[PDB]
Design a binder for this molecule. Structure first.
Ligand code: 3AT
Ligand code: ZN
Ligand code: ZN
Ligand code: ZN
Lengths: 50, 46, 65, 1105, 50, 34
RNA sequence: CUCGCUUCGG
């Protein structure tokens, strides 16, 4: 029910325990991202009856 | 080509082809929404 | 619709303190002492939790399912 | 020794709202109309027959409306929820069926259930499916439990029939004319005829004017015509005061100048002064005296009845009217129209009753005409009505009248417009307040004076603050929180009690008794019920009987001592309000009664029956003495106010501490809050509307009025509480502007969602060819859909979840051009939009006409920015002038940085102390975890919140020590910090921003189009041209009005002076004198129009030198 | 993060990149970073009694 | 066909509420205004 | 598209 943009905004506000000093600023563009300057989090929840 | 829809109360996957009167099996309800797309969508946290 | 993750003014994480707050209301606690026990000192987070309406379950009652 | 106070007295208000109040007006009126009134109308028109072929008839037996159903299924009905009617763009109606008996071939044939029409069904009415349902059942039906209901659904749109306000009928009105002459008027209206008859004093003598008379005639002649012939009796009826005879003498002299002395002579005079109604077909012996007598008996003063050509009562009525005119001709006691004791409210029920009566009469007339055309000529195959009873007549009439909103009743000569309006779904408060609106009989069409004013009669009945700010200020009004509209009564027991109470019959005495100082006339709905002495006993007995229950509690009795008239009102539409009865300085309501009410022993009806609370009409409350509070009760007090804050309406109930503000601020807040952004209902996700505004994280207000609790506004909030600090910052908040915090907006403050609708139809035409949607046109180069068709699914309809850009197709619609192979031309539904939008859902339905209805719900997520309008629940509408970073914001010792910085300068001019008190109360409440109340004429006092603040360690006045965010140094002055309930308005800069290139032009005059929706350009009005002229800028004026708008080059013949084409003059058949000339296109259109009007403009050209 | 009902599903991936709170408030590390001057209340004359 | 370069790549592309049939190769505006 | 009607905004 939560809209996609609202869900993304909520996910952005969640703090991440990763140490920022170990990464670098992502370059302008480069939406793919590399190992140095990004992290990936998978969220997969399927609700079903008990 | 299987075109799939979801009725408003059964919420069951119904495959209907072109020029079919809009209905649903195991119901008679006639509001037939379309399923969400499979293409990836990118959103900005801003 | 749903409890905001962050407090609007200060920015303290308030999203994770919602359901537990309800537990304190499911218990005998008043509003003020429950907010004190949750650790909301400045009044902005107290306004965040106190004035929030949980519309998500009422909307989910109208969800397809 | 202060008088004891019943603290729980306010608890009477919710109990009342359990049975009446906000929305129950329309619902009760519609239930009465569909359960009682329709049967009365059918009984009035039960038998229809034709003059040709007697012994043939069609008789109606019983009528039913049934439950709402849909005719989609082939000759089969199916129960339908209102939300389904909303989605399918169909009407939410129920089948009007009737059982009849008629004669086919002189053999009686009866039908027990024969459909004839469809009634659009008001939501939450008796027949509506939503009534008597639980919130879980509401969820199963996809309807919000908090929806007010009371509105019709026609063709998918929600229409509300506004409550009409009009002057009461059959009442004497003494008024001044344009020339200052004090005349009289009465609009005698019965169930059949409305006629306004006037009395004038134009030459010191009284004439009676009516539309059926060629010329106004002296009143004495009319008196002689109506049976009374002696002049002395007429003078006795007028009055025995000396000045009355002095004033009425000239009329007697004028009568005596003519030789009119008998009833026959006056009847002959009137018949001479009679005008034939356009050669009325059929002549009953050169009628004249009979015409005059019929006009006197029927047409003139219709509401006054003549038993059998006995004009005694009508004589008394006109004598009373003459006496009132004479008395008002001295002391200028001219009655005012704006007094709401003379006003009546028509709900949806009465309007629908009139419409159904007209439609049923038309249906019966059509049936009779068909019978006349068919029966006497056809065959031994006997004509029967069932083969001719068209069922679309009533249904189409109802649907068109409700949808378009224009009502044309030829039987009543009533042409009304704007009866129904589209229900506004901007917010819950918007719909709730629109549900209780009242429209005026006069329109903002002109600058009137008086109705627009706030009359004191609106007390307790209508909201004083709630009125639309603009051209319709004062002409659209809102009902108060605790009010009731009366219905019609039987009028029988009132007459019986009045006769038994000593009221002498008027026919038994001469008119001289009317002039006695102690004799009081008693009326009843404009009819003289009689005369009485010692009217105090009669009034007290009538009120006591009404309290006892033998008389209906809505029957009103009032006394006018100046005119010495006791008025008894029993007609419907009058405004009433409950009041606590006070007997000898002690209220009938005690603490024990309120305790029983709280415990559930008794309800409001029990209070009504036990003579504790009684309804007061405006006319009746004119004679009563009402005390606002217990301490105000004195010896001469007859009633007690239940709750003062019920004076305000529904929208004005949102204002915290409204009594601390200036009234224009309250009016602005009512208007603003009608437009507040917020949640609509629990089914706002399944609902698909043309435009919907939602708030991401709505919050209930910290300072809530009891009206908010009563209407359950906190369940559907329409705003957010922001930590407002009142200070001047950066000079970006000069005039009503406010500064927003960038971090707050980044954390979801003010985040809003805009839902728009895009609907398409695929209809099958008369020829067996239909609209079809192609699949996406794949690009052969890349084997992928082209950029325009990027979002389309395999079926040619855009799939939910993707984002749409400008000039992209949502539905790949292609339609035939024939109506031999079909030829399809493309008319795809493109998305016109400045910004990207996301498709949330796509709904596909099929109507009975095989028309495929497709609706896409596009969603946009908008963040507050520069230009977004913000309100503060106190009429302090503002624009976000600057968005500063969080670190630049000032901070307190605790580290709190404000979300909104509002300029202090807005306070002194507007004196909105209520905002300051609300801020203080909200700060105290959030500190101690409470919800303070800003109830009108009450609420939490300043002292208590100050004590709470000092107890919590903050300053007792909200002002806090603050360090500047920029310089890092403390501010010299303490800053006023606190949570304020700010609400975002629908007015956004993104929607309002407009820019115009060359763009399109209009065909008639080649100038840019009008509106933003049509990509129109801005307009240089007449005053802009005047300002440019005043500047003297000739070249810029020429460039703006000629070069940049409608420049054109025409060919003018220098010989004939007319317009040629392509360097050739057809008139002169030559091309030597044709010269090109620059000109505005509108001027060329004007010249051609003038030529068509035979006003030939001939242009004599010359060289520019 | 969100609330679901049976049948509903949330499947997504999140790319996290380094950023400063000036660009967006979601990057701010501190809930509240503030300072106040140390008070020093002084008594001009000796106060005794109630 | 485009009157300038002779191509047949005539695309109907509306640019900010201005209907416009334009060559897709050289950008020559063939027709404009409705 | 034209036209009218309403509701807004100011
Ligand atoms: N019908 C109208 N004609 C011309 N200008 C208008 C009209 N309605 C609004 N405006 C514009 O709005 C401005 C009216 O504001 P003004 O009357 O001075 O303050 P206000 O609306 O009384 O606010 P307060 O109630 O004093 O807070 C001035 C004018 O340019
Ligand atoms: Zn189904
Ligand atoms: Zn906070
Ligand atoms: Zn010529």
């Amino acid at each position: 029910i939560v809209q996609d943009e609202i869900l993304a905004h909520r996910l952005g506000l969640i703090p991440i325990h990763a140490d920022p000093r170990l990464f670098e600023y992502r370059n302008q563009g480069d939406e793919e991202g590399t190992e140095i300057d990004t992290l990936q989090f998978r969220l997969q929840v399927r609700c079903t009856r008990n | 080509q299987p075109m799939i829809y979801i009725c408003g109360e059964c919420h069951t996957e119904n495959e209907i082809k072109s020029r079919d009167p809009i209905r649903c099996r195991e119901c008679g309800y006639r509001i037939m929404y379309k399923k969400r797309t499979k293409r990836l969508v990118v959103f900005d946290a801003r | 619709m749903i409890i905001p993750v962050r407090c609007f003014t200060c920015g303290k994480i308030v999203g994770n303190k919602w359901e537990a707050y309800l537990g304190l209301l499911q218990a005998e606690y008043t509003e003020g002492d429950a907010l004190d026990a949750l650790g909301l000192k400045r009044y902005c987070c107290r306004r965040m939790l106190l004035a929030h309406v949980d519309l998500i379950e009422k909307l989910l009652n109208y969800a397809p399912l | 020794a202060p008088i004891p106070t019943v603290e729980e007295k306010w608890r009477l208000l919710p109990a009342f709202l359990k049975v009446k109040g906000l929305v129950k007006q329309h619902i009760d009126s519609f239930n009465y109309f569909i359960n009682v009134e329709i049967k009365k109308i059918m009984k009035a028109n039960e038998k229809v027959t034709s003059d040709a072929d007697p012994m043939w008839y069609l008789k109606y037996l019983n009528i039913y409306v049934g439950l709402p159903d849909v005719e989609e299924s082939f000759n089969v009905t199916r129960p339908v929820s209102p939300h389904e009617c909303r989605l399918r763009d169909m009407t939410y109606s129920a089948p009007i069926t009737v059982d009849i008996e008629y004669t086919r071939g002189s053999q009686r044939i009866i039908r027990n259930a024969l459909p004839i029409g469809r009634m659009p069904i008001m939501l939450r009415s008796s027949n509506c499916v939503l009534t008597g349902k639980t919130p879980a059942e509401f969820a199963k039906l996809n309807e919000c439990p908090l929806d007010p209901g009371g509105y019709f659904i026609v063709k998918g749109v929600e229409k509300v029939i506004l409550i009409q306000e009009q002057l009461s009928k059959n009442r004497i009105i003494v008024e001044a004319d344009r020339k200052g002459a004090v005349g009289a008027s009465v609009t005698s209206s019965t169930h059949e005829k409305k006629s306004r008859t006037n009395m004038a004093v134009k030459q010191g003598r009284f004439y009676l004017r009516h539309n059926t008379l060629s010329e106004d005639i002296p009143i004495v002649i009319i008196f002689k015509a109506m049976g009374v012939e002696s002049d002395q009796e007429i003078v006795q009826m007028i009055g025995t005061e000396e000045h009355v005879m002095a004033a009425f003498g000239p009329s007697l002299e004028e009568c005596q100048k003519a030789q009119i002395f008998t009833q026959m002579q006056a009847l002959k005079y009137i018949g001479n002064k009679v005008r034939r109604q356009r050669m009325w077909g059929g002549g009953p012996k050169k009628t004249k005296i009979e015409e005059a007598r019929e006009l006197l008996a029927s047409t003139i003063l219709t509401h006054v009845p003549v038993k059998e050509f006995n004009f005694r009562a009508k004589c008394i009525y006109t004598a009373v009217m003459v006496r009132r005119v004479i008395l008002a001709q001295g002391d200028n006691k001219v009655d005012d129209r704006d007094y709401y004791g003379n006003k009546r409210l028509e709900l949806a029920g009465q309007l629908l009753s009139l419409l159904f009566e007209d439609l049923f009469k038309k249906f019966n007339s059509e049936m009779k005409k068909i019978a006349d055309q068919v029966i006497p000529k056809q065959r031994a195959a006997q004509f029967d009505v069932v083969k001719h009873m068209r069922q679309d007549q009533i249904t189409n009439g109802m649907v068109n009248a409700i949808s378009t909103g224009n009502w044309s009743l030829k039987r009543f000569k009533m042409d009304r417009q704007g009866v129904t309006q589209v229900l506004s779904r901007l917010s819950y408060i918007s719909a709730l307040g629109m549900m209780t609106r009242i429209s005026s009989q006069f329109e903002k069409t002109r600058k009137v004076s008086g109705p627009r004013s706030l009359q004191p009669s609106q007390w307790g009945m209508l909201c004083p603050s709630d009125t639309p700010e603009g051209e319709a200020c004062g002409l659209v009004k809102n009902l108060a929180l605790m009010t009731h509209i009366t219905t019609d009564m039987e009028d029988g027991p009132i007459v019986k009690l009045a006769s038994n109470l000593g009221v002498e019959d008027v026919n038994l005495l001469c008119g001289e008794e009317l002039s006695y100082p102690n004799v009081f006339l008693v009326f009843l709905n404009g009819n003289i019920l009689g005369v009485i002495r010692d009217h105090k006993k009669l009034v007290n007995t009538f009120r006591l009987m009404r309290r006892a229950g033998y008389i209906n509690e809505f029957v009103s009795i009032s006394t006018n001592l100046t005119d010495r008239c006791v008025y008894i009102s029993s007609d419907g539409g009058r405004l009433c309000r409950p009041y606590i009865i006070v007997k000898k300085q002690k209220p009938a309501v005690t603490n024990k009664h309120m305790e029983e009410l709280a415990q559930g022993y008794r309800n409001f009806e029990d209070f009504l029956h036990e003579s504790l609370v009684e309804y007061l009409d405006v006319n009746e409350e004119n004679d009563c003495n009402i005390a606002l509070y217990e301490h105000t009760i004195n010896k001469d007090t007859t009633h007690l106010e239940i709750e003062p804050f019920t004076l305000l309406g529904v929208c004005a109930g949102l204002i915290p501490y409204p009594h601390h503000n200036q009234s224009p601020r309250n009016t602005y807040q009512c208007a603003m809050g009608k437009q507040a952004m917020g949640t609509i209902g629990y089914n706002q996700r399944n609902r698909i509307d043309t435009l919907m505004y939602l708030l991401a994280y709505p919050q209930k207000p910290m300072v809530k009025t009891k009206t908010i609790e009563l209407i359950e506004f906190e369940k559907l909030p329409a705003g957010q509480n922001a930590t407002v600090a009142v200070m001047s910052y950066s000079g970006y908040d000069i005039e009503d502007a406010l500064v927003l915090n960038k971090a707050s907006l980044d954390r979801g403050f003010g985040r809003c969602l805009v839902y728009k609708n895009a609907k398409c139809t695929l209809k099958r035409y008369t020829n067996q060819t239909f609209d079809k949607v192609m699949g996406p046109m794949l690009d052969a180069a890349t084997r992928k859909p082209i950029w325009r068709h990027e979002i389309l699914d395999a079926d040619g309809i855009c799939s939910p979840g993707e984002k749409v850009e400008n000039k992209q197709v949502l539905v790949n619609k292609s339609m035939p051009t024939v109506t031999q192979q079909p030829q399809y031309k493309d008319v795809p539904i493109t998305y016109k939009g400045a910004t990207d939008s996301y498709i949330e859902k796509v709904m596909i339905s099929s109507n009975a006409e095989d028309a495929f209805l497709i609706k896409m719900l596009l969603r946009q997520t908008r963040r507050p920015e520069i230009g977004d309008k913000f309100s503060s629940r106190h009429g302090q509408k503002g624009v976000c002038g600057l968005i500063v970073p969080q670190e630049d914001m000032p901070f307190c010792d605790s580290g709190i940085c404000p979300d909104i910085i509002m300029n202090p300068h807005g306070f002194p001019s507007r004196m909105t102390v209520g905002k300051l008190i609300e801020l203080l109360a909200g700060k105290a409440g959030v500190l101690d975890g409470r919800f303070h109340y800003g109830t009108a004429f009450g609420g939490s006092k300043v002292k208590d919140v100050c004590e709470d603040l000092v107890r919590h360690g903050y300053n007792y006045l909200g002002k806090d020590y603050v360090t500047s965010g920029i310089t890092g140094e403390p501010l010299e002055a303490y800053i006023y910090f606190g949570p304020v309930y700010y609400q975002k308005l629908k007015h956004m800069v993104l929607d309002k921003m407009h820019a115009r290139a060359r763009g399109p032009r209009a065909v008639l005059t080649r100038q840019p189009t009008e509106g933003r929706s049509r990509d129109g350009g801005l307009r240089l009005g007449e005053m802009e041209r005047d300002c440019l002229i005043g500047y003297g800028a000739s070249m810029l004026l020429l460039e703006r009005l000629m070069i940049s708008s409608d420049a054109f080059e025409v060919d003018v013949c220098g010989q004939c002076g007319l317009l040629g084409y392509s360097g050739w003059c057809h008139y002169c058949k030559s091309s030597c004198h044709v010269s090109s000339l620059r000109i505005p296109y509108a001027c060329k259109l004007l010249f051609q129009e003038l030529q068509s009007m035979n006003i030939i403009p001939r242009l004599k050209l010359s060289k520019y030198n | 993060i969100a609330q679901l009902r049976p049948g509903q599903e949330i499947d997504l991936l999140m790319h996290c990149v380094k950023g400063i709170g000036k660009d967006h408030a979601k990057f701010s590390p501190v809930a509240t970073a503030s300072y106040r001057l140390l008070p020093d209340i002084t008594l001009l004359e000796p106060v005794e009694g109630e | 066909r485009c009157p300038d370069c002779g191509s047949t790549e005539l695309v109907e592309d509306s640019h900010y509420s201005q209907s416009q049939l334009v060559c897709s190769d050289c950008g020559c505006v063939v027709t404009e205004g409705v």
